[PDB]
C-alpha cells in the first residue's frame, strides 16, 4: 500500500469503504451497533482531543470495540490542525501524540491516516511518508457535516446515490462522512448501506479496499530505537 501519497479509491472495483472522521464522540456507540446489525465493517479516522478526548469517558471502550468488531482504526491527528500550516516537528508530534493515546488504550498505533480538511501537500506528504503513513483521501464526500439536520440529511443520502455509479464493475469509492454528527449515525449510515448493496457494491474497511491484510494495519509495537 502506498506510503506518503494520497489514496482516493480501491485497488479493485465493486467496493465501497465507508469512512468516518472526527470521533469518537456521542453517537459512535450507536454507529457501531448499526454497523454490527448490518454485518458491515467500516473505517474510523479518530482524533485524540477534538469534539471529545479519546481517553475520556467511554471513548477508550468505543475504540476497543472498533477493533474487536474488525473496523479499521486510522489517525486523524491528535488535535485536528491543518497539517500544512505546521513545521515538520509539529506534524510529527500531532501524529505521535495520537499513537501514544491509542497505544495506552489498546496497544496499537495506526499506519493509516487522513489529513484534517484533506489538507496535506507535498511538504506534509514527505513527513507523513517518513513516518510510514498511508494517506487516505476520498473520492465521494457525503457533505454530511453540512446536511446535518433531520430535514436535510436526505440531501447527503441523495448525493451518495447520485455519485455512486450504477457501473459497479468499473468503480470503487472511499466515502467521507463524520460520525460526530448525530444524523450521520441515526439516518445517513443505513441509507448508505442500503444504497451501496442495491447497486451491487460490497462495503469494506479501507484495509480490504487497498488489498492490505489486517496484520499490516497497525504498528503492534513501539521501536525503542528510531
Ligand atoms: Cl522518527
Ligand atoms: Zn476532520
PDB file of C-alpha atoms and ligand atoms in Angstrom:
ATOM      1  CA  UNK A   1       0.000   0.000   0.000  1.00  0.00           C
ATOM      2  CA  UNK A   2       1.496   3.376  -0.995  1.00  0.00           C
ATOM      3  CA  UNK A   3       3.081   5.410   1.833  1.00  0.00           C
ATOM      4  CA  UNK A   4       3.187   9.248   1.944  1.00  0.00           C
ATOM      5  CA  UNK A   5       0.920   9.724  -1.073  1.00  0.00           C
ATOM      6  CA  UNK A   6      -2.852  10.447  -1.037  1.00  0.00           C
ATOM      7  CA  UNK A   7      -5.100   7.490  -1.918  1.00  0.00           C
ATOM      8  CA  UNK A   8      -8.537   8.087  -3.468  1.00  0.00           C
ATOM      9  CA  UNK A   9     -10.085   4.728  -4.496  1.00  0.00           C
ATOM     10  CA  UNK A  10      -9.795   0.939  -4.039  1.00  0.00           C
ATOM     11  CA  UNK A  11      -7.445  -1.487  -5.787  1.00  0.00           C
ATOM     12  CA  UNK A  12     -10.488  -3.406  -7.051  1.00  0.00           C
ATOM     13  CA  UNK A  13     -13.810  -2.261  -8.418  1.00  0.00           C
ATOM     14  CA  UNK A  14     -17.223  -3.077  -6.837  1.00  0.00           C
ATOM     15  CA  UNK A  15     -16.038  -1.954  -3.389  1.00  0.00           C
ATOM     16  CA  UNK A  16     -17.155   0.909  -1.080  1.00  0.00           C
ATOM     17  CA  UNK A  17     -15.155   1.856   2.004  1.00  0.00           C
ATOM     18  CA  UNK A  18     -17.463   3.794   4.336  1.00  0.00           C
ATOM     19  CA  UNK A  19     -15.296   6.087   6.456  1.00  0.00           C
ATOM     20  CA  UNK A  20     -15.972   8.283   9.477  1.00  0.00           C
ATOM     21  CA  UNK A  21     -13.910  11.200  10.742  1.00  0.00           C
ATOM     22  CA  UNK A  22     -13.571  13.403  13.888  1.00  0.00           C
ATOM     23  CA  UNK A  23     -14.617  10.866  16.594  1.00  0.00           C
ATOM     24  CA  UNK A  24     -15.025   9.050  18.726  1.00  0.00           C
ATOM     25  CA  UNK A  25     -17.977  11.000  20.114  1.00  0.00           C
ATOM     26  CA  UNK A  26     -21.555  10.709  21.467  1.00  0.00           C
ATOM     27  CA  UNK A  27     -23.098   8.892  18.509  1.00  0.00           C
ATOM     28  CA  UNK A  28     -20.223   6.451  17.847  1.00  0.00           C
ATOM     29  CA  UNK A  29     -21.555   3.664  20.137  1.00  0.00           C
ATOM     30  CA  UNK A  30     -24.816   3.697  18.271  1.00  0.00           C
ATOM     31  CA  UNK A  31     -22.955   3.704  14.898  1.00  0.00           C
ATOM     32  CA  UNK A  32     -21.007   0.549  15.967  1.00  0.00           C
ATOM     33  CA  UNK A  33     -24.331  -1.090  16.880  1.00  0.00           C
ATOM     34  CA  UNK A  34     -25.850  -0.158  13.483  1.00  0.00           C
ATOM     35  CA  UNK A  35     -22.820  -1.489  11.537  1.00  0.00           C
ATOM     36  CA  UNK A  36     -22.901  -4.716  13.576  1.00  0.00           C
ATOM     37  CA  UNK A  37     -26.610  -5.235  12.906  1.00  0.00           C
ATOM     38  CA  UNK A  38     -25.729  -4.773   9.217  1.00  0.00           C
ATOM     39  CA  UNK A  39     -22.692  -7.026   9.389  1.00  0.00           C
ATOM     40  CA  UNK A  40     -20.717  -4.145   7.861  1.00  0.00           C
ATOM     41  CA  UNK A  41     -17.135  -3.153   8.664  1.00  0.00           C
ATOM     42  CA  UNK A  42     -16.044   0.456   8.219  1.00  0.00           C
ATOM     43  CA  UNK A  43     -13.039   2.721   8.926  1.00  0.00           C
ATOM     44  CA  UNK A  44     -12.639   5.412  11.616  1.00  0.00           C
ATOM     45  CA  UNK A  45     -10.215   8.311  11.454  1.00  0.00           C
ATOM     46  CA  UNK A  46     -10.052   9.323  15.036  1.00  0.00           C
ATOM     47  CA  UNK A  47      -8.764  12.361  16.905  1.00  0.00           C
ATOM     48  CA  UNK A  48      -7.091  12.479  20.346  1.00  0.00           C
ATOM     49  CA  UNK A  49      -8.778  15.701  21.533  1.00  0.00           C
ATOM     50  CA  UNK A  50     -11.269  17.393  19.182  1.00  0.00           C
ATOM     51  CA  UNK A  51     -15.045  17.016  19.915  1.00  0.00           C
ATOM     52  CA  UNK A  52     -14.003  14.952  22.951  1.00  0.00           C
ATOM     53  CA  UNK A  53     -10.849  13.389  24.406  1.00  0.00           C
ATOM     54  CA  UNK A  54     -10.275   9.834  23.031  1.00  0.00           C
ATOM     55  CA  UNK A  55      -9.169   8.820  26.544  1.00  0.00           C
ATOM     56  CA  UNK A  56     -12.172  10.312  28.393  1.00  0.00           C
ATOM     57  CA  UNK A  57     -15.365   8.635  29.474  1.00  0.00           C
ATOM     58  CA  UNK A  58     -16.325   5.590  27.475  1.00  0.00           C
ATOM     59  CA  UNK A  59     -14.173   6.576  24.472  1.00  0.00           C
ATOM     60  CA  UNK A  60     -11.389   4.026  25.270  1.00  0.00           C
ATOM     61  CA  UNK A  61     -14.105   1.301  25.334  1.00  0.00           C
ATOM     62  CA  UNK A  62     -15.546   2.515  21.975  1.00  0.00           C
ATOM     63  CA  UNK A  63     -12.052   2.398  20.420  1.00  0.00           C
ATOM     64  CA  UNK A  64     -11.602  -1.151  21.756  1.00  0.00           C
ATOM     65  CA  UNK A  65     -14.978  -2.134  20.270  1.00  0.00           C
ATOM     66  CA  UNK A  66     -13.938  -0.718  16.873  1.00  0.00           C
ATOM     67  CA  UNK A  67     -11.013  -3.144  16.788  1.00  0.00           C
ATOM     68  CA  UNK A  68     -12.996  -6.040  18.311  1.00  0.00           C
ATOM     69  CA  UNK A  69     -15.604  -5.635  15.576  1.00  0.00           C
ATOM     70  CA  UNK A  70     -12.963  -5.580  12.797  1.00  0.00           C
ATOM     71  CA  UNK A  71     -13.201  -1.902  11.800  1.00  0.00           C
ATOM     72  CA  UNK A  72     -10.008  -0.204  10.723  1.00  0.00           C
ATOM     73  CA  UNK A  73      -8.846   2.465  13.120  1.00  0.00           C
ATOM     74  CA  UNK A  74      -6.791   5.258  11.410  1.00  0.00           C
ATOM     75  CA  UNK A  75      -5.231   8.506  12.778  1.00  0.00           C
ATOM     76  CA  UNK A  76      -6.823  11.884  12.049  1.00  0.00           C
ATOM     77  CA  UNK A  77      -4.062  13.699  14.080  1.00  0.00           C
ATOM     78  CA  UNK A  78      -4.304  14.421  17.789  1.00  0.00           C
ATOM     79  CA  UNK A  79      -5.851  17.961  17.783  1.00  0.00           C
ATOM     80  CA  UNK A  80      -7.153  18.377  14.195  1.00  0.00           C
ATOM     81  CA  UNK A  81      -4.855  21.214  12.974  1.00  0.00           C
ATOM     82  CA  UNK A  82      -4.351  21.874   9.250  1.00  0.00           C
ATOM     83  CA  UNK A  83      -1.077  19.877   8.854  1.00  0.00           C
ATOM     84  CA  UNK A  84       0.172  22.231   6.015  1.00  0.00           C
ATOM     85  CA  UNK A  85       0.405  25.072   8.473  1.00  0.00           C
ATOM     86  CA  UNK A  86       2.761  23.179  10.841  1.00  0.00           C
ATOM     87  CA  UNK A  87       6.536  22.678  10.904  1.00  0.00           C
ATOM     88  CA  UNK A  88       7.700  19.127  10.388  1.00  0.00           C
ATOM     89  CA  UNK A  89       8.445  18.681  14.153  1.00  0.00           C
ATOM     90  CA  UNK A  90       4.834  19.793  14.966  1.00  0.00           C
ATOM     91  CA  UNK A  91       3.320  17.460  12.324  1.00  0.00           C
ATOM     92  CA  UNK A  92       5.385  14.582  13.743  1.00  0.00           C
ATOM     93  CA  UNK A  93       4.096  15.498  17.208  1.00  0.00           C
ATOM     94  CA  UNK A  94       0.472  15.577  16.037  1.00  0.00           C
ATOM     95  CA  UNK A  95       0.812  12.007  14.734  1.00  0.00           C
ATOM     96  CA  UNK A  96       2.838  10.617  17.692  1.00  0.00           C
ATOM     97  CA  UNK A  97       0.519  12.046  20.305  1.00  0.00           C
ATOM     98  CA  UNK A  98      -2.398  10.192  18.816  1.00  0.00           C
ATOM     99  CA  UNK A  99      -0.315   6.963  18.520  1.00  0.00           C
ATOM    100  CA  UNK A 100       0.638   7.274  22.209  1.00  0.00           C
ATOM    101  CA  UNK A 101      -3.061   7.549  23.139  1.00  0.00           C
ATOM    102  CA  UNK A 102      -4.132   4.553  21.014  1.00  0.00           C
ATOM    103  CA  UNK A 103      -1.227   2.586  22.483  1.00  0.00           C
ATOM    104  CA  UNK A 104      -2.416   3.399  26.027  1.00  0.00           C
ATOM    105  CA  UNK A 105      -5.960   2.388  25.011  1.00  0.00           C
ATOM    106  CA  UNK A 106      -5.410  -0.870  23.134  1.00  0.00           C
ATOM    107  CA  UNK A 107      -1.642  -1.333  22.490  1.00  0.00           C
ATOM    108  CA  UNK A 108      -1.682  -0.224  18.826  1.00  0.00           C
ATOM    109  CA  UNK A 109      -0.651   2.656  16.606  1.00  0.00           C
ATOM    110  CA  UNK A 110      -2.298   3.310  13.205  1.00  0.00           C
ATOM    111  CA  UNK A 111      -0.418   3.037   9.930  1.00  0.00           C
ATOM    112  CA  UNK A 112      -3.400   4.664   8.205  1.00  0.00           C
ATOM    113  CA  UNK A 113      -4.345   8.301   8.461  1.00  0.00           C
ATOM    114  CA  UNK A 114      -6.486  11.087   6.934  1.00  0.00           C
ATOM    115  CA  UNK A 115      -5.397  14.727   6.931  1.00  0.00           C
ATOM    116  CA  UNK A 116      -7.764  17.226   8.658  1.00  0.00           C
ATOM    117  CA  UNK A 117      -9.637  19.155   5.856  1.00  0.00           C
ATOM    118  CA  UNK A 118      -7.945  16.822   3.322  1.00  0.00           C
ATOM    119  CA  UNK A 119      -5.180  19.357   3.522  1.00  0.00           C
ATOM    120  CA  UNK A 120      -1.719  17.767   3.079  1.00  0.00           C
ATOM    121  CA  UNK A 121       0.511  18.928   0.262  1.00  0.00           C
ATOM    122  CA  UNK A 122       3.906  17.716  -0.870  1.00  0.00           C
ATOM    123  CA  UNK A 123       5.618  19.161   2.263  1.00  0.00           C
ATOM    124  CA  UNK A 124       3.143  17.439   4.561  1.00  0.00           C
ATOM    125  CA  UNK A 125       3.234  14.194   2.474  1.00  0.00           C
ATOM    126  CA  UNK A 126       7.026  13.907   2.770  1.00  0.00           C
ATOM    127  CA  UNK A 127       6.859  13.956   6.544  1.00  0.00           C
ATOM    128  CA  UNK A 128       3.941  11.524   6.720  1.00  0.00           C
ATOM    129  CA  UNK A 129       5.834   9.222   4.362  1.00  0.00           C
ATOM    130  CA  UNK A 130       8.934   9.396   6.566  1.00  0.00           C
ATOM    131  CA  UNK A 131       6.548   8.217   9.369  1.00  0.00           C
ATOM    132  CA  UNK A 132       5.404   5.309   7.183  1.00  0.00           C
ATOM    133  CA  UNK A 133       1.774   6.514   6.963  1.00  0.00           C
ATOM    134  CA  UNK A 134      -0.777   5.656   4.300  1.00  0.00           C
ATOM    135  CA  UNK A 135      -2.633   8.889   3.436  1.00  0.00           C
ATOM    136  CA  UNK A 136      -6.390   8.267   2.773  1.00  0.00           C
ATOM    137  CA  UNK A 137      -8.368  10.923   0.872  1.00  0.00           C
ATOM    138  CA  UNK A 138     -11.866  10.425  -0.639  1.00  0.00           C
ATOM    139  CA  UNK A 139     -13.470  10.204  -3.984  1.00  0.00           C
ATOM    140  CA  UNK A 140     -17.029  10.679  -2.606  1.00  0.00           C
ATOM    141  CA  UNK A 141     -17.753  13.283   0.001  1.00  0.00           C
ATOM    142  CA  UNK A 142     -21.223  12.977   1.567  1.00  0.00           C
ATOM    143  CA  UNK A 143     -21.183  16.565   2.896  1.00  0.00           C
ATOM    144  CA  UNK A 144     -22.925  15.084   5.929  1.00  0.00           C
ATOM    145  CA  UNK A 145     -21.460  17.895   8.105  1.00  0.00           C
ATOM    146  CA  UNK A 146     -23.488  20.405   6.046  1.00  0.00           C
ATOM    147  CA  UNK A 147     -26.588  18.301   5.790  1.00  0.00           C
ATOM    148  CA  UNK A 148     -26.829  17.510   9.436  1.00  0.00           C
ATOM    149  CA  UNK A 149     -30.480  18.269  10.421  1.00  0.00           C
ATOM    150  CA  UNK A 150     -33.391  15.795  10.416  1.00  0.00           C
ATOM    151  CA  UNK A 151     -34.952  17.530   7.403  1.00  0.00           C
ATOM    152  CA  UNK A 152     -31.745  17.870   5.369  1.00  0.00           C
ATOM    153  CA  UNK A 153     -29.815  14.623   5.817  1.00  0.00           C
ATOM    154  CA  UNK A 154     -31.646  13.272   2.736  1.00  0.00           C
ATOM    155  CA  UNK A 155     -29.516  15.680   0.660  1.00  0.00           C
ATOM    156  CA  UNK A 156     -26.446  13.704   1.783  1.00  0.00           C
ATOM    157  CA  UNK A 157     -28.118  10.350   1.085  1.00  0.00           C
ATOM    158  CA  UNK A 158     -29.091  11.652  -2.365  1.00  0.00           C
ATOM    159  CA  UNK A 159     -25.625  12.969  -3.048  1.00  0.00           C
ATOM    160  CA  UNK A 160     -24.313   9.467  -2.269  1.00  0.00           C
ATOM    161  CA  UNK A 161     -26.810   7.783  -4.615  1.00  0.00           C
ATOM    162  CA  UNK A 162     -26.062  10.329  -7.384  1.00  0.00           C
ATOM    163  CA  UNK A 163     -22.319   9.803  -7.158  1.00  0.00           C
ATOM    164  CA  UNK A 164     -22.343   6.072  -6.712  1.00  0.00           C
ATOM    165  CA  UNK A 165     -22.140   4.884 -10.354  1.00  0.00           C
ATOM    166  CA  UNK A 166     -24.509   2.024 -11.333  1.00  0.00           C
ATOM    167  CA  UNK A 167     -21.450   0.740 -13.159  1.00  0.00           C
ATOM    168  CA  UNK A 168     -20.285  -1.464 -10.283  1.00  0.00           C
ATOM    169  CA  UNK A 169     -17.663  -3.299 -12.389  1.00  0.00           C
ATOM    170  CA  UNK A 170     -15.722  -0.111 -13.293  1.00  0.00           C
ATOM    171  CA  UNK A 171     -15.794   1.843  -9.994  1.00  0.00           C
ATOM    172  CA  UNK A 172     -14.921   1.828  -6.280  1.00  0.00           C
ATOM    173  CA  UNK A 173     -15.167   4.520  -3.559  1.00  0.00           C
ATOM    174  CA  UNK A 174     -13.625   5.739  -0.341  1.00  0.00           C
ATOM    175  CA  UNK A 175     -16.523   7.614   1.240  1.00  0.00           C
ATOM    176  CA  UNK A 176     -16.144  10.561   3.578  1.00  0.00           C
ATOM    177  CA  UNK A 177     -18.646  11.009   6.474  1.00  0.00           C
ATOM    178  CA  UNK A 178     -18.257  12.303  10.109  1.00  0.00           C
ATOM    179  CA  UNK A 179     -19.795  10.208  12.885  1.00  0.00           C
ATOM    180  CA  UNK A 180     -19.719  13.282  15.217  1.00  0.00           C
ATOM    181  CA  UNK A 181     -22.990  14.346  13.554  1.00  0.00           C
ATOM    182  CA  UNK A 182     -25.981  12.573  15.009  1.00  0.00           C
ATOM    183  CA  UNK A 183     -27.769  12.415  11.653  1.00  0.00           C
ATOM    184  CA  UNK A 184     -24.743  10.690  10.071  1.00  0.00           C
ATOM    185  CA  UNK A 185     -25.340   7.916  12.568  1.00  0.00           C
ATOM    186  CA  UNK A 186     -29.149   7.620  13.053  1.00  0.00           C
ATOM    187  CA  UNK A 187     -30.158   8.250   9.487  1.00  0.00           C
ATOM    188  CA  UNK A 188     -27.471   8.511   6.827  1.00  0.00           C
ATOM    189  CA  UNK A 189     -25.480   5.318   7.569  1.00  0.00           C
ATOM    190  CA  UNK A 190     -28.372   2.878   6.951  1.00  0.00           C
ATOM    191  CA  UNK A 191     -29.146   4.676   3.711  1.00  0.00           C
ATOM    192  CA  UNK A 192     -25.521   4.406   2.518  1.00  0.00           C
ATOM    193  CA  UNK A 193     -25.524   0.619   3.241  1.00  0.00           C
ATOM    194  CA  UNK A 194     -28.863   0.122   1.580  1.00  0.00           C
ATOM    195  CA  UNK A 195     -27.898   2.185  -1.443  1.00  0.00           C
ATOM    196  CA  UNK A 196     -24.475   0.537  -1.879  1.00  0.00           C
ATOM    197  CA  UNK A 197     -25.963  -3.046  -1.740  1.00  0.00           C
ATOM    198  CA  UNK A 198     -28.809  -2.039  -4.026  1.00  0.00           C
ATOM    199  CA  UNK A 199     -26.207  -1.322  -6.739  1.00  0.00           C
ATOM    200  CA  UNK A 200     -24.094  -4.473  -6.126  1.00  0.00           C
ATOM    201  CA  UNK A 201     -21.235  -2.980  -4.134  1.00  0.00           C
ATOM    202  CA  UNK A 202     -19.729  -4.635  -1.040  1.00  0.00           C
ATOM    203  CA  UNK A 203     -18.790  -2.476   1.961  1.00  0.00           C
ATOM    204  CA  UNK A 204     -15.223  -2.949   3.174  1.00  0.00           C
ATOM    205  CA  UNK A 205     -12.592  -1.421   5.505  1.00  0.00           C
ATOM    206  CA  UNK A 206     -10.038   0.777   3.759  1.00  0.00           C
ATOM    207  CA  UNK A 207      -7.561  -2.073   4.534  1.00  0.00           C
ATOM    208  CA  UNK A 208      -9.500  -4.501   2.347  1.00  0.00           C
ATOM    209  CA  UNK A 209     -10.240  -1.731  -0.199  1.00  0.00           C
ATOM    210  CA  UNK A 210      -6.420  -1.487  -0.711  1.00  0.00           C
ATOM    211  CA  UNK A 211      -5.690  -5.257  -0.571  1.00  0.00           C
ATOM    212  CA  UNK A 212      -3.965  -4.901   2.851  1.00  0.00           C
ATOM    213  CA  UNK A 213      -4.027  -7.815   5.331  1.00  0.00           C
ATOM    214  CA  UNK A 214      -5.286  -6.787   8.791  1.00  0.00           C
ATOM    215  CA  UNK A 215      -1.937  -7.830  10.240  1.00  0.00           C
ATOM    216  CA  UNK A 216      -0.471  -4.832   8.401  1.00  0.00           C
ATOM    217  CA  UNK A 217      -2.887  -2.173   9.601  1.00  0.00           C
ATOM    218  CA  UNK A 218      -1.032  -1.228  12.774  1.00  0.00           C
ATOM    219  CA  UNK A 219       2.278  -0.902  14.407  1.00  0.00           C
ATOM    220  CA  UNK A 220       1.682  -3.567  17.095  1.00  0.00           C
ATOM    221  CA  UNK A 221       4.979  -2.462  18.824  1.00  0.00           C
ATOM    222  CA  UNK A 222       6.962   0.644  19.671  1.00  0.00           C
ATOM    223  CA  UNK A 223      10.564   0.540  18.440  1.00  0.00           C
ATOM    224  CA  UNK A 224      12.751   1.746  21.259  1.00  0.00           C
ATOM    225  CA  UNK A 225      15.355   2.987  18.804  1.00  0.00           C
ATOM    226  CA  UNK A 226      14.448   5.148  15.810  1.00  0.00           C
TER     227      UNK A 226
HETATM  228 CL1  LIG B   1      11.416   9.013  13.602  1.00  0.00          CL
HETATM  229 ZN1  LIG B   2     -11.784  16.150  10.341  1.00  0.00          ZN
END
